[model samples]
Target: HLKFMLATNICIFTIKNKPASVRERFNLNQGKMCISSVTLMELIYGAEKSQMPERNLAVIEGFVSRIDVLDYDAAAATHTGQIRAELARQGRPVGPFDQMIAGHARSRGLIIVTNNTREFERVGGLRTEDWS
Candidate 1:
């Protein structure tokens, strides 16, 4: 059953100039939005391998602390299995980790913010936006 919840929409903003509409829609407030744990891992890996690890880590930490960090739940795993099956049937090359992120968002009724929209768009009722 759907409830009139007002939680902020989830997004992956990895650019210098993010769209104003996205910020407006999601309310750009601390503790209101969320990013998938997958995104957090990607950020950590990227920062660790990059030239400026400390700087990147600081930025990521700041963002992580500000928003709600959504992790993979049982419902997410179930939906991810469905997503994987659907992708296999279509002979699509969906990344394993991304499927989980999409499933988590879909199962929890959260929006996804990322530069990669096409992959998440394949799943019905899943809202996605490009922040790059």
Candidate 2:
């Protein structure tokens, strides 16, 4: 079974460091945790556009290998469109690409690990963590 489904408790961390709760809940040393692919794309895009692309790419690539890559699917795309419309109606703005990521996670019932929690919290039923 997926460990997350069986977990009676879930822990989240900021991007800076692992939360104490996370450390206690899961064995980091066992390499059992992961981040969403959307997070990875965000990192990559940031690095690619930065002044030090090569250096940033190297650092980003290192992180990319540590997490499992979840793909975006049709259901996610449909949900993303709905989320986009909702955000527009509220006059709240988020990065266009973020919707796709949020949709993908929500469709799969996965918690999001991100520093920009506010952007995603708008989606009802979506769980998030601040990794900042």
Candidate 3:
């Protein structure tokens, strides 16, 4: 499967950093690219308050226009709680937003594209790939 949810960091670099190869990849994989609604929410929330307000939003919208935005459903919630509990038990609990992203990916059967692999690897059944 070629589906992947672009993590917030990936979004940040792609838009602000303007890595040409990365920009091309995002464009090339238009149909394959995706994001969780949570991710979008975070992205928009940040851009809304940025100094370059209009430009930041425009850049985000460019990607938002092309990707699938996964919803946080009942299944996602269930996975979220499960992942949190398991990690706490293992003493490897990630942050809340990470849990939202990872849990949604786990429930939706989608792989997460994140730079932070160490913590993500601790969540059972959560598949992750690095954008790099």
Candidate 4:
């Protein structure tokens, strides 16, 4: 019954070779865990820009292959637009990608695992967990 969305930070940390037990620490199945398409894009972009793109890309492949990747579809876009507008009006807007990822998680009613809770926490009704 536990479903979770991994933020780009978590994904990066996860694939960076840490020894910590992610599934055990979080109590989730790979099939039950998801990442926003936006998050995937960010990871891909980072890998493309890194010194060893192929190596980093392989690392990404190894990790995401086990989990689900949720598309940034209409529902997620709808939530993102609303969240951005509201946060802008409140003068606490998170980053564009953060809004996209947060909106994706919120649209699916999943809790997001991110180290940057400072940003996501500003979005009203958004739930976040940090593993740091």
Candidate 5:
């Protein structure tokens, strides 16, 4: 079951940085891992900003090959809007990327795995966990 959607920070932590314990958990649950298109964009942004673009881009390419990238389509957009609007209503909005990832995961009923749980936990009904 593809039950976990990885946030951008988690992706960076597992791929670019070394977190042995988190990496072990990531490898053990490879089959349950996926990422939002938003997360992919974030990774691409990081690669582009780095000094060695070609190498970082290649690294991201190889990493994504092993994990599915879920599209941020209409359904996810709707959920994202709701999440944002609700948070706004309560006067507690999360970062734009966090909101989008939360919506994408919620839309697919997937638990989000992130290194930053505080922001994700703000989205009501959205399940979140951290491996690092």
Candidate 6:
């Protein structure tokens, strides 16, 4: 199994402020990181919002290009709705972006790697780790 799906903040950190090599920081294997399509959108939007020029954008793009992408498709969508409904029932609905990221990780059975553990922890059965 792929073992890990990176949260948006983790992606950003790995791109910008990673204090050591990703291998040292995460202590993870080379092929272990996975990114959700939703995360892709979030990262690109964040980068664009920074108003950086095209060349500057390459830092974000370069880091993104190497990892595997987890698409938001039927299975993930169905699971996402289930997670939302369950959280709503519990009066713990997470933000939309977080909920979707949880869905991607849950549906595919991958652990979430994030600095946003407190928020993600609100999601039942969604395992999270902070490698920062």
| lDDT values for all models | 0.64, 0.60, 0.80, 0.82, 0.89, 0.79
**For model 2, how does the per-residue alpha-carbon lDDT over 1-132 read when each residue is reduced to its tens digit?**
121211111222322135564544444423545545555666777778999999988876765465455666688788788888988899996877667777776777776655577787878967876522
TM-score for predicted model 4 compared with the true structure: 0.88
Which of candidates 3 and 5 is the stronger one according to lDDT?
A: 5
Q: Give the Å error, residue 54, model 3.
A: 2.8
Model 3 has an lDDT value of: 0.80
Candidate 3, residues 2-50, lDDT tens digits: the string is 4787788887767755555566666667688778888888988888898
What is the descending lDDT order? 5, 4, 3, 6, 1, 2
**Residue 51 C-alpha lDDT in model 1:** 99
Question: Model 1: how far is 41 from its true place, Å?
Answer: 0.7
Q: Which candidate is the best by TM-score?
A: 5
Superposed model 6: Cα runs more than 4 Å off: 18-23
What's the C-alpha lDDT at position 118 in model 1?
A: 76
Q: Which stretches of candidate 2 lie over 4 Å from their true place?
A: 1-36
- Worst 10 contiguous positions by lDDT, candidate 1: 1-10
Number of the top candidate by lDDT?
5
* Per-residue alpha-carbon lDDT of candidate 1 for residues 4-115, written as tens digits (9 for 90 to 100): 1122222333222255555555454435456667767876887789899999888678766755666667898998899889888888757777788777778888766665
Error of 6 at 95 (Å): 1.4
Taking the candidates one at a time, how many backbone clashes does each contain?
Answer: 2, 5, 0, 0, 0, 0
Model 5 residue runs over 4 Å out of place are none
TM-score of each: 0.72, 0.65, 0.87, 0.88, 0.94, 0.86
Alpha-carbon RMSD of each model: 4.6, 5.7, 1.9, 2.1, 1.2, 2.2
Backbone clash pairs for candidate 3 read: none
Candidate 6 colliding pairs: none
Range of the 10 consecutive residues with the lowest summed lDDT in candidate 4: 17-26
